[PDB]
């Protein structure tokens, strides 16, 4: 059940995700997956970032569901579930601002 996944935050808003991620205690690459508020049927990978000029900031990556079943952020790689996606991007950033490091708490 994705519901029980530790990195999955269900229906929290865009503003709630940022609130959770923008915190001193979180590594760059702390992240969560949520349903998209605005795009029905989509997801969103929310990742904390930091640059010395803006400080801690969050980047949001829409995750689209292929009708045939998969998930994608880019045309580069596609995956059979959000779990396989969370796992790949933890090993390689491939375009994302930072590799996924920490699950949001």
Could you give the C-alpha distances from 9 to 34, 61, 86, 87, 92, in angstroms and in order? Answer: 5, 15, 13, 17, 22
Structure method: X-ray
User: Are 45 and 72 a contacting pair, CB within 8 Å?
Assistant: no
The token pair at 84 is 């396989």
Domain ranges of the chain: 1-105
Concatenating the DSSP letter of every residue in 15-61 gives: HHHHHHH-STTSPTTEEEEEE-SSSTT-EEEEEEEEETTTEEEEEEE
Query: Which residue, among 18, 17, 50, has the nearest Cα to 34 in the 3D structure?
Result: 17
Q: Right CATH number for 1-105 from 3.30.505.10, 3.40.50.1820, 3.40.50.300, 3.30.830.10?
A: 3.30.505.10
- DSSP lists the bridge partners of residue 36 as none
Resolution for this experimental structure (Å): 2.2
């Amino acid at each position: 059940s994705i519901q029980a996944e530790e990195w999955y935050f269900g229906k929290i808003t865009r503003r709630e995700s940022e609130r959770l991620l923008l915190n001193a205690e979180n590594p760059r690459g702390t992240f969560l997956v949520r349903e998209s508020e605005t795009t029905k049927g989509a997801y969103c990978l929310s990742v904390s970032d930091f640059d010395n000029a803006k400080g801690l900031n969050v980047k949001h990556y829409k995750i689209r569901k292929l009708d045939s079943g998969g998930f994608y952020i880019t045309s580069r790689t596609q995956f059979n579930s959000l779990q396989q996606l969370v796992a790949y991007y933890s090993k390689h950033a491939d375009g994302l601002c930072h590799r996924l490091t920490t699950v949001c708490p």
